[PDB]
Write a protein that binds this ligand. Structure first.
Ligand SMILES: *[C@@H]1O[C@H](CO)[C@@H](O)[C@H](O)[C@H]1NC(C)=O
Ligand SMILES: *[C@@H]1O[C@H](CO)[C@@H](O)[C@H](O)[C@H]1NC(C)=O
Length: 400
């Protein structure tokens, strides 16, 4: 679509770049809401397409018509507030509902000029953030992750692509979903929209999950037919790490009986270790709460190697078969070396209630308390605050 003339007022977010030798340096970034959250409408008020579908055929017979008929609305700071997004200093507060309207925001980190996504090169580096998870009950997902979105939102692929990163265009992830727009142009062919994806943090106050999802195609690729499915170009399931799945059920959860208490703030430090040739070989994680380092626990089931980090051997042993077929940890590492976009979001799920994250082997939630209708009876205004985002050398983004 074509942006109107309203003024975009991106919330500011301060973030940090650190090195062992000179500490962490503060800088200015901006947050942009997904293109779809801005509101894409025809002149008469009708929409241009819903998630899961090709864009409205009357409005979008071809790419050029779609660009002219579908209008994206700029978002001023009140529009950002009303979409559940506010910031303050180094803190990003995302709210699931505003005046009982589901806003479920998803946002990306922009460079200081606001014209390009801030491209993070994570292989061989460290990534830390503080988080506040207390208002996320079962069924909620407060996510911090990376996708290999085009840095300019897809503007360079076509003369009809106008939004760019400035208005939040170009989203993709490893599920290869069909969205009405792809790279800022109408998805006339209905391709699924795929790209490598690194889920650093997928969580609620009851359970947390980590999962790299490699794709065999680099950058944003529109799939067709079987390319979009489970035997296609991207690993839908990923190679997961959730302490509850490896039988360490007192590691993370609500209260002082857990190693990491989700009702209070804590720091998440992730280190992407590379070998001598520069390939990614392992993903490590540790936590800081009350000034103590809390190391991840070693696998506590029979089968996988007795370690506390992700590697190819841990993935093969715990059944991540598409991950291994698509290249495993090296493949994810390549995407992460080309550079990826940081995405933050909050959501729930009517279809499965986030079962994979916090039910059965994955956590302590029963089978219905994660239903959107029951979540509000536990927490009327589910939300998450991410803050103090620090990117740098291994050993430099956090400390005790
Ligand atoms: C498709 O666009 C046409 C033209 O504006 C509009 O009349 C119709 O309401 C739209 N259909 C949907 C489902 O939005
Ligand atoms: C889970 O943990 C207990 C020890 O806490 C261990 O004895 C048990 O066998 C483990 N279960 C599996 C299936 O590994």
């Amino acid at each position: 679509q074509t942006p109107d003339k309203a003024k975009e007022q991106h919330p500011k977010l301060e973030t940090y770049r650190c090195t062992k030798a000179s500490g962490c340096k503060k800088q200015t970034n901006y947050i942009v809401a997904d293109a779809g959250i801005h509101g894409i409408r025809q002149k008469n008020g009708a929409g241009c397409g819903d998630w899961g579908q090709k864009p409205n055929a009357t409005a979008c017979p071809d790419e050029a018509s779609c660009a002219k008929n579908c209008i994206l609305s700029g978002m001023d700071s009140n529009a950002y507030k009303n979409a559940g997004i506010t910031t303050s200093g180094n803190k990003l507060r995302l709210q699931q509902l505003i005046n009982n309207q589901l806003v479920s925001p998803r946002v990306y980190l922009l460079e200081e000029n606001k014209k390009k996504y801030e491209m993070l090169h994570l292989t061989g580096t460290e990534f830390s953030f503080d988080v506040e998870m207390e208002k996320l009950p079962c069924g909620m997902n407060g996510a911090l992750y990376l996708s290999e979105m085009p840095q300019d939102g897809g503007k360079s692929t076509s003369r009809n692509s106008k939004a760019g990163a400035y208005y939040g265009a170009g989203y993709c992830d490893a599920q290869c979903y069909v969205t009405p727009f792809i790279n800022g142009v109408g998805n006339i062919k209905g391709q699924g929209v795929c790209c490598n994806e690194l889920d650093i943090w997928e969580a609620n106050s009851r359970a947390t999950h980590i999962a790299p999802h490699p794709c065999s195609k680099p950058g944003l690729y529109g799939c067709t037919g079987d390319e979009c499915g489970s035997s296609g170009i991207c690993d839908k399931a990923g190679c997961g790490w959730n302490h509850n799945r490896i039988n360490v059920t007192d590691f993370y959860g609500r209260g002082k009986q857990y190693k990491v208490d989700s009702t209070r703030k804590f720091t998440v430090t992730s280190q992407f270790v590379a070998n001598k040739q520069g390939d990614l070989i392992e993903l490590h994680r540790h936590y800081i709460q009350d000034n103590k380092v809390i190391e991840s626990a070693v696998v506590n089931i029979s089968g996988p190697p007795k370690i506390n980090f992700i590697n190819d051997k841990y993935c093969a042993a715990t059944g991540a078969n598409e991950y291994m077929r698509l290249g495993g940890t090296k493949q994810m590492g390549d995407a992460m070396s080309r550079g990826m976009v940081l995405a933050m979001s909050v959501w729930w799920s009517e279809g499965d209630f986030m079962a994979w994250l916090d039910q059965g082997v994955a956590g302590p939630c029963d089978a219905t308390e994660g239903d959107p209708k029951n979540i509000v009876k536990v927490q009327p205004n589910p939300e998450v605050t991410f803050s103090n985002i620090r990117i740098g050398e291994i050993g430099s983004t956090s400390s005790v």
